[PDB]
């Protein structure tokens, strides 16, 4: 639920961090 919907955030935080390098 809350963690399922919030997943869209964490995933976006790792994508930008993994692509920023």
């Amino acid at each position: 639920g809350i963690f399922s919907k919030l997943a869209g955030k964490k995933i976006k935080n790792l994508l930008i961090s993994g692509l920023k390098g």
Side-chain angles (χ1 to χ4, degrees), residues 2-18:
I2 46 118
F3 265 119
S4 309
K5 58 87 128 174
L6 160 63
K9 171 47 175 210
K10 159 53 133 141
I11 64 95
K12 215 295 218 81
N13 190 29
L14 178 47
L15 193 55
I16 60 94
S17 267

